[PDB]
Design a protein around this motif. Sequence first.
Motif, PDB file in Angstrom:
ATOM      1  N   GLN A  94       2.032  -9.226  31.058  1.00 33.13           N
ATOM      2  CA  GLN A  94       1.292  -8.208  30.334  1.00 33.13           C
ATOM      3  C   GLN A  94      -0.065  -8.002  31.011  1.00 33.13           C
ATOM      4  O   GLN A  94      -0.606  -8.887  31.640  1.00 33.13           O
ATOM      5  N   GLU A  95      -0.629  -6.826  30.796  1.00 35.33           N
ATOM      6  CA  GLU A  95      -1.785  -6.390  31.553  1.00 35.33           C
ATOM      7  C   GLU A  95      -3.119  -6.929  30.998  1.00 35.33           C
ATOM      8  O   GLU A  95      -4.087  -6.945  31.738  1.00 35.33           O
ATOM      9  N   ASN A 118      -4.168 -11.357  30.457  1.00 36.78           N
ATOM     10  CA  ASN A 118      -3.562 -10.760  31.619  1.00 36.78           C
ATOM     11  C   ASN A 118      -2.735 -11.847  32.287  1.00 36.78           C
ATOM     12  O   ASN A 118      -3.284 -12.910  32.606  1.00 36.78           O
ATOM     13  N   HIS A 120       0.966 -12.612  34.813  1.00 34.53           N
ATOM     14  CA  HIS A 120       2.191 -12.220  35.537  1.00 34.53           C
ATOM     15  C   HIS A 120       3.443 -12.725  34.802  1.00 34.53           C
ATOM     16  O   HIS A 120       4.539 -12.375  35.171  1.00 34.53           O
TER      17      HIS A 120
END
Length: 363
Positions: A94-95, A118, A120
Amino acid sequence: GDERFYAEHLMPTLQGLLDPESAHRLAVRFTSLGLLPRARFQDSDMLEVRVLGHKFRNPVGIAAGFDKHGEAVDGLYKMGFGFVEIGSVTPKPQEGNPRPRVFRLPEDQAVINRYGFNSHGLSVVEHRLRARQQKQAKLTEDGLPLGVNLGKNKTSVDAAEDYAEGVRVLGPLADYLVVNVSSPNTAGLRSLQGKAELRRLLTKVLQERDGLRRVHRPAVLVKIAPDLTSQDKEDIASVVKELGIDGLIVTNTTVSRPAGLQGALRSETGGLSGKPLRDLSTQTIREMYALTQGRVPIIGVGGVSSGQDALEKIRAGASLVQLYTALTFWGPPVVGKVKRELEALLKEQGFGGVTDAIGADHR
Ligand SMILES: CN(C)CCCCC(=O)Nc1ccc(NC(=S)NC(=O)c2ccc(C(C)(C)C)cc2)cc1
Ligand SMILES: Cc1cc2nc3c(=O)[nH]c(=O)nc-3n(C[C@H](O)[C@H](O)[C@H](O)COP(=O)(O)O)c2cc1C
Ligand SMILES: CCCCCCCCCC[N+](C)(C)[O-]
Ligand SMILES: O=C1C[C@@H](C(=O)O)NC(=O)N1
Ligand SMILES: [Cl-]
């Protein structure tokens, strides 16, 4: 000499030229390629600690958040850290929050961040750790352990299931796991520190951990906030003893804003780190050590920039310490500086080693 360059020239130029997120990405990159001095401080025997089922060549670790995705682990050992913690890692990628989401308060030697996990994601981190798994097994055996810090996805419907997935996927690759229930930047997360929620969550985490094969079975720690009530700390202590949790990481960033902050960015939303957190963190260590009768290893974190800072946490009950924010201001030389000053202070105060100092203030 070399600590005086980074502190007064390089870090003021790095930080003056780039926004803090950019600067951090560049630092991860540089660190990951091993473009650092090479690191001259030779760790004394005085600095070795045995805790959590492992040997730690020195008690100074990199806190979670610097290497979120496990990209720079080897470069971080080369920097002189005794142990490396990566993460927080979420199950799915998620970013995180929109930018800007990190802020320097140089007049306070502090940082505020609202990254919002944030990540990966587990799969990418699993593959990155698998690629070096044996190398890490040799590092661990040589006294350089690896921790993995787990978080939860923003939209997850079942927090406990997110942590359990984290145990299943990265537990086999870690010396210790951290159940990070203390980020200020994910809605509802810190609620998971409450008594019934915490017990249910950690039961499930420990069950999952216990179901791993023995040489892949990590210690499990819980990372807590510095903003807890007395009731909340009592309750955590109770659950940690009832369930046999292996240790505590004390503390995350604060949502408080201590009086006296000068940085222009002091009213930004997020968690505050660095020197304004230091004594709040130390005091939280002190209380958690007393509430657990010194039987539960603590990793002390928050505002460590010096040997004195490290020793204050150790004396208050930490077996190990971490730092992050100090790197923003002092750069990589700060690691050797903390170690050298800690060794000298241990000698000065008549301790034979770090182990003898752990909890000394309570004796
Ligand atoms: C001219 N050069 C840059 C190369 C000279 C020799 C190698 C070197 O400088 N390496 C190097 C390695 C790491 C760093 N910086 C580190 S470890 N940390 C950061 O700069 C940093 C850490 C945290 C943050 C936030 C996200 C907390 C604000 C930002 C930056 C700087 C330089
Ligand atoms: C930019 C930044 C990002 C962070 N990300 C995380 C994280 O993902 N997980 C975590 O448990 N702690 C995270 N932390 C908290 C640190 O691990 C540490 O608990 C806190 O910053 C106090 O130590 P310091 O004063 O030495 O930075 C982060 C801290 C900063 C400054
Ligand atoms: C590597 C594939 C997964 C990418 C998912 C997006 C995660 C954003 C992490 C943020 N950042 C790259 C700046 O560290
Ligand atoms: O645990 C955490 C997570 C992090 C973030 O925003 O990702 N910020 C923090 O200060 N602590
Ligand atoms: Cl203000």
